[PDB]
Write a protein that binds this ligand. Structure first.
Ligand code: UDP
Ligand code: UDP
Ligand code: UMP
Ligand code: UMP
Ligand code: MG
Ligand code: MG
Lengths: 228, 232
């Protein structure tokens, strides 16, 4: 019975950065980071299935997207049962969606011919099902679109220095950025999950370095939150 | 209220052949076959010609062992779960026969493919958690009440595989069948296969020797089933 909100955007736009700005001096706010740490070592509930994916996508992209998405829905679900339901005015923020996996990233790869048509049918059969009983409660109350041009994104992918993702072309980020605008701005993107069409969208321009200029966005979120 | 019973055995032992003799036998009896149909042609799940993932897994197992086993298990979990909600729930002595359980998927077919090196370490690591957590979530509904093992020599299975005519599996070596036979015997007969799900060790099994052609001489066996069920 908490306000579940997704912090969405591109590769190193600054999601995890703002997620940690929000984790701070907000007792009624706790964040759920995408398991990009647990995708790096694949062990018992290591091996790098993200690097394997980035390396031979026309091979591991499917195995990966499946593990990636499962790890999300596992962590997301588990967070609420525990944590702090008792607090009076709670908000739980999710680094990425279960939807962004299927509709922006896994779709992207399929189109980029990394996912065999039959790999795509399976992924979808799987996803449309995982989010029925497990992603039942786990439904969204709002999405925060951290907008950043693919241009800055690329500099900030290096600025990070994550080696698996250093061989990323602007053209890739560019093709992602378009799936984003199509989903969260223009809203031309059509999903199987029909409630998602109506839910709110706070667009924030994170092109301008917000590391020590966070105080404005946080006001604009506190606003967006009063709404829901 | 619904008794759940697994019909287990090696490839082409006579699971469906046996399960259809019992489906006819009573009104309070119903079967849940394995979705080999949706594996042969992978479709978009529509209600009011897709690839063959089983053929893919066969011709190049290095590549489709994991992909198939995941789909295979999902489709099973999906199908089974569906049967319980069906209209036959209100009856006196209603049983359910399942063509293979979610345990044979992992502990026989998936594990062997990992032993045969077709599926890599991290491919295996992923499978297991997935199968664990997924199965554990909403687990109570699917617990078996008993298992029926249809015992046939790997050579009988090779004959029945040929008797069937499944193009894709017409290349299955004796050794493959021989390997799977050992994993069934280990689990369902010698009862030495340790599985994560602990309830299993306490479920009653009924082993039958389908080495002789039962399409005709089924009378003896059924009566055994009937009495095995009276003791559940
Ligand atoms: O105001 C900011 C926010 C982020 N970053 C850089 O952006 C990356 C962090 O982005 P993050 O991983 O948080 O975003 P996500 O990957 O979740 O999109 C790193 O390179 C940071 O140094 C930056 O330089 N200034
Ligand atoms: O006593 C028997 C049992 C089976 N079969 C044939 O053997 C093949 C494999 O049987 P089935 O599909 O039932 O085996 P399963 O794969 O279900 O264990 C089929 O063509 C059956 O008609 C047969 O001729 N006689
Ligand atoms: O559905 C997803 C989600 C994430 N990623 C990868 C992209 C990034 O390299 C890595 C971490 O995400 P960012 O925080 O860098 O966006 O996750 C995918 O490939 N597919
Ligand atoms: O978990 C499974 C289940 C089935 N099969 C294969 C073996 C058979 O060729 C076919 C199913 O038919 P029978 O098991 O009914 O023979 O799928 C597997 O490899 N793994
Ligand atoms: Mg990240
Ligand atoms: Mg069969």
């Amino acid at each position: 019975r908490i306000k579940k909100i997704s912090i969405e955007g591109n590769i190193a736009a600054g999601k995890s950065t703002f997620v940690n700005i929000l984790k701070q001096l907000s007792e009624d706010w706790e964040v759920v980071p995408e398991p990009v740490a647990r995708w790096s070592n694949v062990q018992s509930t290591g091996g790098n299935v993200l690097q394997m994916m980035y390396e031979k996508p026309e091979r591991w992209s499917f195995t990966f997207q499946t593990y990636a998405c499962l790890s999300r829905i596992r962590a997301q679900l588990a967070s609420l049962n525990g944590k702090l339901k008792d607090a009076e005015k709670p908000v739980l923020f999710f680094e990425r969606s279960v939807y962004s996996d299927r509709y922006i990233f896994a779709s992207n790869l399929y189109e980029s011919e990394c996912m065999n048509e039959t790999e795509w049918t399976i992924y979808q059969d799987w996803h449309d099902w995982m989010n029925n009983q497990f992603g039942q409660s786990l439904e969204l109350d709002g999405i925060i679109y951290l907008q950043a041009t693919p241009e800055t994104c690329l500099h900030r992918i290096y600025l990070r220095g994550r080696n698996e993702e250093q061989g990323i072309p602007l053209e890739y980020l560019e093709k992602l950025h378009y799936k984003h605008e199509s989903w969260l701005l223009h809203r031309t993107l059509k999903t199987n999950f029909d409630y998602l069409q109506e839910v709110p969208i706070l667009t924030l321009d994170v092109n301008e370095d917000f590391k020590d200029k966070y105080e404005s966005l946080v006001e604009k979120v506190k606003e967006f939150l009063s709404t829901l």
